[PDB]
Design a protein around this ligand. Structure first.
Ligand SMILES: COc1ccc(CN2CCc3c(c(C(=O)NCc4cccc5ccccc45)nn3CCNC(C)(C)CO)C2)c2ccccc12
Ligand SMILES: [Cl-]
Ligand SMILES: [Cl-]
Ligand SMILES: [Cl-]
Ligand SMILES: [Cl-]
Length: 69
């Protein structure tokens, strides 16, 4: 395939990002580092935003975009 943009691949990205963010060591890593790392795993800004909300550590999309800029 499935292509990057398809829902099956978006869902693998966001669900893997959620697992990542839940790890206890990852919880003690700063936001910026985690955002750049999620970009390196293929997530868009909006998908990164989704993942952070899913784990109860919401960031604004503007904040995510700023970090990635
Ligand atoms: C930016 O900061 C960090 C980066 C990386 C690490 C090392 N790992 C951590 C656990 C971790 C990682 C990853 C990890 O890298 N998962 C893969 C992945 C993540 C995000 C988006 C993806 C999108 C497409 C494909 C894979 C993706 N996952 N856990 C926890 C869960 N482990 C499994 C897979 C068994 C599910 O229960 C990476 C870090 C380790 C400690 C602190 C910071 C870290
Ligand atoms: Cl947990
Ligand atoms: Cl924090
Ligand atoms: Cl979830
Ligand atoms: Cl924020």
């Amino acid at each position: 395939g499935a292509m990057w943009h398809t829902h099956s691949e978006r869902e693998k990205r966001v669900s893997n990002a959620v697992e990542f963010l839940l790890d206890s060591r990852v919880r003690r890593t700063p936001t910026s580092s985690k955002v750049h790392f999620l970009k390196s795993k293929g997530l868009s800004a909006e998908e990164i935003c989704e993942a952070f909300t899913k784990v109860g550590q919401p960031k604004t999309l503007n904040e995510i975009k700023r970090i990635l800029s």
